[PDB]
Amino acid sequence: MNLLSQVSFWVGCGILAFGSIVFGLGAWNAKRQSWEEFYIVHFTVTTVAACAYLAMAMGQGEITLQNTDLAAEGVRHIYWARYCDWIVTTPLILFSICRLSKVRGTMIAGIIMSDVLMIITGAIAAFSFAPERYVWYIVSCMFEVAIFVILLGAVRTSAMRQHYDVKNLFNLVFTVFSIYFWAYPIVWILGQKGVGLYGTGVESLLIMLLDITAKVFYGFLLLRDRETLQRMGQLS
Amino acid sequence: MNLLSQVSFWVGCGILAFGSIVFGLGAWNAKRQSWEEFYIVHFTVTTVAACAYLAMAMGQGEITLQNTDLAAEGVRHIYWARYCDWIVTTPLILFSICRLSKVRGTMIAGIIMSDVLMIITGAIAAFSFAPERYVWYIVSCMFEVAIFVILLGAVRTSAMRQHYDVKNLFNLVFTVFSIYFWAYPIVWILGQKGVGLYGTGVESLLIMLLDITAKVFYGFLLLRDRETLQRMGQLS
Amino acid sequence: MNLLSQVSFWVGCGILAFGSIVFGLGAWNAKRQSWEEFYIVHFTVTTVAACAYLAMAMGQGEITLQNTDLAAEGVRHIYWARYCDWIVTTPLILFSICRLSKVRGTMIAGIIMSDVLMIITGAIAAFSFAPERYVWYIVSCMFEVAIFVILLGAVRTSAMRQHYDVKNLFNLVFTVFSIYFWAYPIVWILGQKGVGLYGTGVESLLIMLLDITAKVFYGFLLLRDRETLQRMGQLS
Ligand SMILES: *C/C=C(C)/C=C/C=C(C)/C=C/C1=C(C)CCCC1(C)C
Ligand SMILES: *C/C=C(C)/C=C/C=C(C)/C=C/C1=C(C)CCCC1(C)C
Ligand SMILES: *C/C=C(C)/C=C/C=C(C)/C=C/C1=C(C)CCCC1(C)C
Ligand SMILES: CCCCCCCCCCCCCCCC
Ligand SMILES: CCCCCCCCCCCCCCCC
Ligand SMILES: CCCCCCCCCCCCCCCC
Ligand SMILES: CCCCCCCCCCCCCC
Ligand SMILES: CCCCCCCCCCCCCC
Ligand SMILES: CCCCCCCCCCCCCC
Ligand SMILES: CCCCCCCCCCCCCC
Ligand SMILES: CCCCCCCCCCCCCC
Ligand SMILES: CCCCCCCCCCCCCC
Ligand SMILES: CCCCCCCC
Ligand SMILES: CCCCCCCC
Ligand SMILES: CCCCCCCC
Ligand SMILES: CCCCCCCC
Ligand SMILES: CCCCCCCC
Ligand SMILES: CCCCCCCC
Ligand SMILES: CCCCCCCC
Ligand SMILES: CCCCCCCC
Ligand SMILES: CCCCCCCC
Ligand SMILES: CCCCCC
Ligand SMILES: CCCCCC
Ligand SMILES: CCCCCC
Ligand SMILES: CCCCCC
Ligand SMILES: CCCCCC
Ligand SMILES: CCCCCC
Ligand SMILES: CCCCCC
Ligand SMILES: CCCCCC
Ligand SMILES: CCCCCC
Ligand SMILES: [Cl-]
Ligand SMILES: [Cl-]
Ligand SMILES: [Cl-]
């Protein structure tokens, strides 16, 4: 295994496990049901990812596949543990944003469905040879568009409607999510699974940076935002 | 791949994707929550199947297995993508019928459980050699019986009790479902997985006709029925 | 296959199928929704396990793997059908105990999450070589600790708070569960997957005895307890 990959996995595991300690002890100490739910959701997020990173750090959850002539020179290292992690953790992150926005349940169900299909077709893409890999990559990207038509549409609207004097708070919530979410397909397609701009070591580093941003630091941002809304009296 | 199979997959993909356009744009435009839920459920149904048909059309999601002497002459083409599709789409079709009938949640949970086990044991059957394949086929058929004791019993009863002057409407809902649902195990057992009456091409054509009936045209029937009930004032 | 294994699988299948008859006919005959839910949950428990035992009895659902020098002499027989069964049946048993205790939903979600991760890391452990197998075994055991901090904490507390004059009833509910639940990791680690104290035949017998205890006889205990609470008037 690439050394940069090896190190990125151990570093992601430890950072994610730090988040699990914060969220887990928060759930243990929370008295209000809405804080128990928040912490339990975000504890699952970091803990599932921390398990996936532990497996990759130990040399598991990976399969190496040959590339064709319609692909980058060499091979692709498919860390299928990533998609097992993502199919569970990304619907939970979206669920958390939706609960903070207080949006109706039909939008929650629609955004979770779009997200699960985005991940599933992403994993099909990763295992596919070209040109099928590229067809599935585009299908996965269109499911990502459907996530954002729901998020920046009905979810954001319900967030602005049911809260007062917190436009900048929710703007940061949706803007920061929007940025790291769109970075994943870019990081993916610039590696060996698309254009051979960089190899599996750099890709592993970039994904790890995205993962700790989305699961630990973004979680802390939603935590702080919940505190702000509670001190204002518009949390529940 | 068989040409009739190849064509049936492309034809099913396009027809299913037509349904996804109808249901998806209906969800986008729906103002009432109960219409949002209806369209989102049926959009998932056609879209998941359309993805499975795209994979099979492109030559993926299939494994060919040898038959024993207790089986039809030749081999069996197992399109395992079918069961990944079915384990998600058939509980959603049943959920839609149950919501239209306004039945209590315990019956919804019971019918979904029976259905998921029907599909799982069906996939075990398909991967099994004889005689195990035949044992699992019978077990799967008994789970299908359990679906209908719930459907034609408590679900239908609650549909007739909580609605007025729409006996013929609900009769068609349960009768049309009953017919295509029982056709699947027949189509399955007359192909190479049971009696060798026809090969994988004809079976692929028959399944595709069942799939577009159940997911597109039956969906349009439930759509029209929802409109009828709404114009009568007994939708919610 | 080991004869003791062969017999234990057929015996477990028949005993589990006996439980499915009791719980299934109870669901069919139940008039109150809360009894319908109880029977449907416990019918799923025995029926899913009975399917898994039928597969193992017929020689399916098993893979044999080589052991290293950091492991017991010989091989490990991994019945992966067990974990497919467990990932579905153990969250349902916990759900049933939580509903009987009338605990808030956040605790139900937390205990189900801990349980699913316990089973998943257990299956990773089983497929892993040493030393990874031992790392995952410990991780799985820590998820089991997290189940019991929730169960003996918030769930038990809510059981004592919302019921009168039934301390001994609930004490038996949590004590009997506690005992068989902790026996599983012990049985697992004393077989070929840990210390080579006994082989796959004895392990298969011990698991089968645990499985019928947890799914049939413990189910009958919760049934009798529900009857007691109903005759007292504190069931719902
Ligand atoms: C904690 C993990 C997170 C936030 C992961 C997010 C993942 C995505 C937004 C995935 C995107 C993909 C595409 C739209 C297509 C190409 C492949 C994927 C699966 C990386
Ligand atoms: C859109 C897909 C639909 C409506 C599929 C329905 C599938 C079934 C009713 C499956 C039935 C099966 C049996 C009862 C046993 C033999 C194999 C199966 C899985 C085809
Ligand atoms: C009906 C099945 C039941 C009650 C199964 C319960 C299973 C467990 C408590 C599993 C425990 C495990 C560990 C904590 C680690 C080692 C391996 C497992 C998965 C056996
Ligand atoms: C000792 C090396 C064996 C390699 C195979 C062991 C199986 C590893 C499975 C890892 C799956 C990770 C998914 C994480 C999501 C919870
Ligand atoms: C959403 C349900 C559809 C399930 C279809 C799974 C297809 C997986 C295909 C994996 C690629 C293997 C063949 C590679 C051909 C380029
Ligand atoms: C519902 C959980 C049970 C999971 C059992 C999976 C069994 C799959 C067996 C596949 C057939 C392979 C062996 C073929 C022997 C005829
Ligand atoms: C990794 C830090 C420990 C995490 C503990 C997770 C369990 C959460 C407890 C939920 C409240 C239980 C109080 C009875
Ligand atoms: C405020 C009420 C929230 C209810 C959430 C229900 C969402 C269920 C999602 C299930 C997965 C998506 C299936 C289409
Ligand atoms: C294939 C046709 C497009 C399907 C779009 C699916 C997204 C559904 C939108 C739900 C309402 C969002 C309004 C903000
Ligand atoms: C009208 C209320 C509907 C509630 C539906 C709950 C059904 C949950 C099904 C989960 C799968 C089945 C598990 C046994
Ligand atoms: C194995 C014994 C039969 C089990 C039947 C399971 C179906 C449960 C029926 C639920 C009530 C349906 C009444 C209309
Ligand atoms: C009394 C209300 C019960 C509601 C139960 C909700 C539990 C949902 C569990 C879903 C799996 C766990 C995900 C973290
Ligand atoms: C080997 C590259 C290190 C990158 C660290 C990035 C810190 C934000
Ligand atoms: C090569 C590992 C880089 C670690 C970056 C840490 C960012 C918080
Ligand atoms: C060993 C290959 C496993 C593939 C799992 C894919 C999960 C999305
Ligand atoms: C090759 C057979 C064509 C079948 C078309 C059926 C139209 C309903
Ligand atoms: C061989 C493909 C037949 C297509 C039938 C279309 C039915 C609507
Ligand atoms: C490559 C074989 C996959 C089998 C998947 C079965 C899903 C029901
Ligand atoms: C071969 C050992 C039989 C064990 C039976 C145990 C009865 C409780
Ligand atoms: C060797 C099979 C033992 C069966 C034990 C039955 C316990 C109820
Ligand atoms: C043939 C190996 C299947 C492994 C399935 C593991 C399910 C937890
Ligand atoms: C956390 C310990 C990992 C040991 C590496 C095999
Ligand atoms: C693997 C090199 C041959 C592929 C041509 C598309
Ligand atoms: C305000 C939501 C979209 C922001 C993305 C830059
Ligand atoms: C490989 C066939 C291309 C499919 C385009 C939808
Ligand atoms: C594959 C032919 C031999 C099988 C006999 C049951
Ligand atoms: C009226 C429901 C059953 C009809 C099947 C022909
Ligand atoms: C192959 C054994 C037959 C099992 C019948 C239940
Ligand atoms: C399989 C025997 C060699 C393993 C040494 C750790
Ligand atoms: C009273 C619950 C814990 C009992 C375990 C022996
Ligand atoms: Cl390629
Ligand atoms: Cl055969
Ligand atoms: Cl080993």
Residue numbers in the entry:
A (entry chain A), B (entry chain A), C (entry chain A): 1 to 236
Study authors write:
Rhodopsin is a photoreceptor membrane protein that binds retinal as the sole chromophore, a simpler light-utilizing system than the chlorophyll-based photosystem, which consists of many proteins and typically multiple chromophores. Here, we used a metagenomic mining approach, which led to the identification of a novel rhodopsin clade unique to cyanobacteria, cyanorhodopsin-II (CyR-II). CyR-IIs function as light-driven outward H+ pumps. The CyR-II clade is further divided into two subclades, YCyR-II and GCyR-II, based on their specific absorption wavelength.
The crystal structure of cell-free-synthesized P7104R was solved at 2.07 Å to clarify the red-shifted absorption mechanism of P7104R. The P7104R monomer was composed of seven transmembrane helices (helices A–G) as well as other rhodopsins. A detailed comparison between the structure of P7104R and N2098R or BR showed that a pentagonal cluster near the retinal of P7104R, which is known to be important for proton transport, consisted of three water molecules adjacent to the Lys215P7104R, Asp85P7104R, and Asp211P7104R (corresponding to Lys216BR, Asp85BR, and Asp212BR). The structure around the proton exit was also similar in arrangement, although Glu (Glu182N2098R and Glu194BR) was replaced by Lys193P7104R. The cyclohexane ring comprising the retinal chromophore of P7104R was more slanted than those of N2098R and BR. A comparison of the amino acids around the retinal showed that the Ile171N2098R was rearranged to a Trp182P7104R containing a larger functional group, and the distorted structure of the retinal was canceled by Trp182P7104R, through Phe181P7104R and Glu144P7104R (orange bold). The F181W, W182I, and F181W/W182I mutants of P7104R absorbed at wavelengths of 565.0, 565.5, and 557.5 nm, respectively, which were blue-shifted compared with the wild type of P7104R (λmax = 570 nm). These results provide support for the hypothesis and indicate that Phe181P7104R and Trp182P7104R play a role in the red-shift of the absorption maximum in YCyR-IIs. Through our structural analysis, the high pKa value in P7104R may also be stabilized via a hydrogen bond between Ser96P7104R and His42P7104R.
